[PDB]
Design a protein around this ligand. Structure first.
Ligand code: ZN
Ligand code: ZN
Lengths: 52, 52, 146, 52, 193, 111, 145
């Protein structure tokens, strides 16, 4: 049933923590690669090695 | 969610959708859900999922 | 547009103008509306300054009209419908005018005294092209729908 | 790296900007457009066969 | 589809918007103006020209099926009207600013209660229980074309709009009170209105 | 620069002045012949930009669909400023992300 | 002053009160009719014989050993009958008055501006063997939708 799908309430707090705690890991990428401090390589390109 | 080896593509214009700025290279928009089929999915998300 | 054969020649642009018949360099058509003199023709395409880059590409384009060279020949190089007919000039000229009023950009206006309007559009069309080979934007998206 | 850069097309790929055509009468004509010029004069001064 | 005539009446006439030549050097640019792809006109300050058109759709003085475009990167102002467009009734905001500080919502609870006065109908005449058939005559909901989207910036839920309005002056978020739900993207990346 | 010429505005072909030894432009239509403007003639260029100032976001403030900054509008004065990048087909044209104020239009760059 | 979600529905319910489903189908035909068509016949109304405006006529039937009684679908259909009405365009030859001559037949789309129902109340749709839920959109040519 559903119950088999609903993760522990306490242990679900720690889920939403490690997700929103990976926003900060993009923040430090969306803005840090607007100051040309990536960088890229190999296979290219620079916009792609960001997407990566 | 993906598509041809690149997170939700832009177009129209320089944006994923008309509920977003421009140059929004952030997950909070470009194909990327935070919830599961329990809460679960949000409009601005629901579609991204269907087109992947 | 063409841009191959590093031996021939300098990357030159053309047109078709349905429904007949072949390829017809651009200057040939401006010279068939009311703008034969050079310079003025480029004014409809680009706007200096300029920006020669986008224009330069014209060099090879104009050369194609280095024989036009007025209004007579222009309408002349248009004898090819078709199913074997004509004979020859006068008639050909008449057909050219008809085309310019129904075939050549059929919307806008299909009256008679409105050939100066279709003179810019072509400039506008080819304005877009130049933006892409020079790599100044991106090829429109056929996905729309939109 | 000795080999990495020992089996590549190479050719005129470093120029890519580029080729310019200047018309200069006397073998001692220039202008610019920058600095140079001096180097050219030094090469001519050594008149080691100029006439040839 | 709607007639392509009375449309230029509100364009050549206003304003000024000049046709014919007007090209060598000056004008462009000086942006241009297509209509059904028919580029007859040059027009200068697009500013006044647009707001005043869009208010023609909100009063219905013109067919509500008309799109508008303002490509501030390629110039131009495309204006379609030929049949085959697709729409999608939205709500609007109308930000001058002027009334109600800056924003925000373009409908009032008032409006709604009024709507319900017609569900209980019929029971009148025309007049006519203004049930949607007028909610456009009153510039509340604009139908948007597919190509009109590009130049627009829609919102998802009113809640998002309210949060953005509070931020414009600094207001708590309160994310430690929400319970299992569709975790939205908070708060709101830039985007002032 | 290679232009047209008075009389019969037309293309201008190159022509050296042997004897004299100097630049000199002309046309194949008439006879007009004006002096040169610079030693330069034709340039190749494999591509390295093509925007510089991409004049001129003069339509960004009215672009409801665009982001904005917060105070710090070099010169002029005031707060609120729209920005944006370029990105054209290929690159890697990094991201010289620029900006524009709402009460002005000073393309104030930044690292 | 805030606006809640339960209200939005109370808005978009209005849209389906008037606009209904299939509204445009159904409407791209409600405009044909009169409509733009009387001008298209005028683009080539020449012959060394001129074409006038065209009288709008409701869907009828004429048959041998019978008479002129209009159609009442869907009591038709099963008679494998095609559901059209006649066109009548005033022709010009000169005797002042036109000619009102019949020019083939054009198949009408159920529930239109010029259909046999349009403004008919639910309680009266039944009498005719119809169904208040039908939303038109279709043609009954040769007896089949
Ligand atoms: Zn000349
Ligand atoms: Zn400022």
């Amino acid at each position: 049933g559903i119950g088999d799908t609903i993760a522990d309430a306490d242990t679900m707090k720690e889920v939403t923590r490690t997700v929103k705690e990976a926003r900060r890991q993009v923040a430090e990428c969306i803005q840090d690669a607007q100051h040309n401090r990536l960088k890229p390589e190999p296979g290219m390109t620079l916009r792609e090695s960001f997407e990566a | 969610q993906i598509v041809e080896g690149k997170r939700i593509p832009f177009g129209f214009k320089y944006r994923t959708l008309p509920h977003f700025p421009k140059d929004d290279d952030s997950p909070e928009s470009r194909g990327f859900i935070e919830n599961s089929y329990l809460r679960g999915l949000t409009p601005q998300e629901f579609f991204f999922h269907a087109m992947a | 547009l063409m841009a191959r054969n590093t031996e021939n020649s300098g990357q030159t642009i053309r047109a078709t103008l349905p429904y007949i018949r072949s390829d017809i360099p651009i200057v040939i058509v401006f010279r068939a509306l009311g703008v034969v003199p050079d310079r003025d023709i480029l004014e409809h395409i680009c706007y200096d300054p300029n920006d020669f880059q986008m224009l330069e590409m014209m060099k090879p384009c104009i050369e194609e009209a280095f024989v036009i060279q007025d209004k007579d020949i222009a309408l002349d190089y248009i004898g090819k419908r078709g199913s074997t007919t004509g004979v020859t000039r006068e008639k050909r000229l008449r057909y050219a005018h008809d085309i310019l009023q129904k075939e050549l950009l059929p919307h806008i206006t299909t009256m008679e005294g409105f050939e100066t309007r279709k003179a810019f559009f072509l400039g506008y069309m080819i304005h877009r092209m130049l933006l892409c080979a020079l790599e100044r934007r991106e090829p429109d998206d056929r996905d729309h729908f939109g | 790296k000795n080999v990495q850069t020992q089996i590549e097309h190479t050719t005129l790929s470093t120029v890519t900007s580029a080729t310019e055509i200047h018309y200069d009468p006397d073998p001692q004509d220039t202008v610019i457009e920058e600095d140079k010029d001096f180097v050219e004069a030094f090469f001519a001064i050594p008149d080691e066969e100029v006439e040839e | 589809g709607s007639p392509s005539a009375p449309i230029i009446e509100f364009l050549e006439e206003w304003g000024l918007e000049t046709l014919e030549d007007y090209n060598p050097s000056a004008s462009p640019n000086a942006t241009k103006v297509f209509v059904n792809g028919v580029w007859l006109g040059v027009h200068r300050d697009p500013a006044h020209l647009t707001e005043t058109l869009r208010s023609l759709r909100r009063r219905l003085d013109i067919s509500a099926e008309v799109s508008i475009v303002r490509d501030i990167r390629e110039k131009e102002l495309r204006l379609f009207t030929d049949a085959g467009r697709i729409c999608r009734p939205l709500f609007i905001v109308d930000n001058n600013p002027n009334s109600e500080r800056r924003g925000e919502l373009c409908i009032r609870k008032e409006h709604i209660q009024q709507l319900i006065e017609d569900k209980d109908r019929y029971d009148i005449d025309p007049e006519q229980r203004f049930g949607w058939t007028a909610l456009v005559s009153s510039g509340l909901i604009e139908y948007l074309d597919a190509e009109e989207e590009e130049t627009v910036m829609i919102a998802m839920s009113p809640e998002d709009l309210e949060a953005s309005r509070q931020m414009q002056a600094g207001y708590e978020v309160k994310e430690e009170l929400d319970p299992a739900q569709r975790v939205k993207p908070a708060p709101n990346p830039h985007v002032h209105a | 620069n290679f232009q047209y010429c008075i009389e019969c505005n037309n293309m201008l072909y190159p022509r050296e002045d042997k004897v004299d030894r100097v630049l000199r432009l002309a046309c194949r239509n008439c006879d007009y012949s004006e002096i040169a403007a610079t030693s330069k003639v034709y340039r190749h260029e494999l591509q390295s930009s093509n925007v510089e100032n991409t004049t001129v976001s003069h339509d960004a403030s009215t672009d409801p669909t665009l982001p904005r900054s917060d105070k710090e509008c070099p010169r002029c004065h005031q707060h609120e400023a729209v920005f944006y990048q370029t990105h054209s087909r290929r690159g890697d044209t990094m991201m010289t992300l620029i900006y524009v104020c709402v009460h002005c239009g000073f393309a104030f760059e930044e690292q | 002053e805030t606006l809640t979600q339960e209200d939005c529905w109370t808005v978009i319910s209005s849209f389906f009160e008037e606009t209904s489903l299939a509204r445009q189908q159904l409407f791209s035909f409600d405009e044909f009719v009169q409509n733009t068509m009387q001008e298209i016949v005028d683009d080539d109304s020449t012959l060394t014989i001129n074409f006038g405006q065209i009288y709008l006529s409701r869907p009828t039937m004429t048959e041998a050993d019978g008479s002129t009684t209009t159609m009442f679908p869907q009591e038709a259909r099963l008679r494998n009958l095609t559901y059209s009405s006649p066109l009548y365009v005033d022709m010009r030859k000169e005797d002042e008055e036109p000619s009102k001559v019949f020019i083939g037949k054009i198949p009408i789309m159920l529930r239109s501006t010029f259909c046999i129902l349009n403004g008919v109340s639910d309680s009266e749709l039944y009498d005719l063997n119809e169904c208040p839920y039908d939303q038109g959109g279709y043609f009954i040519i040769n007896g089949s939708e």
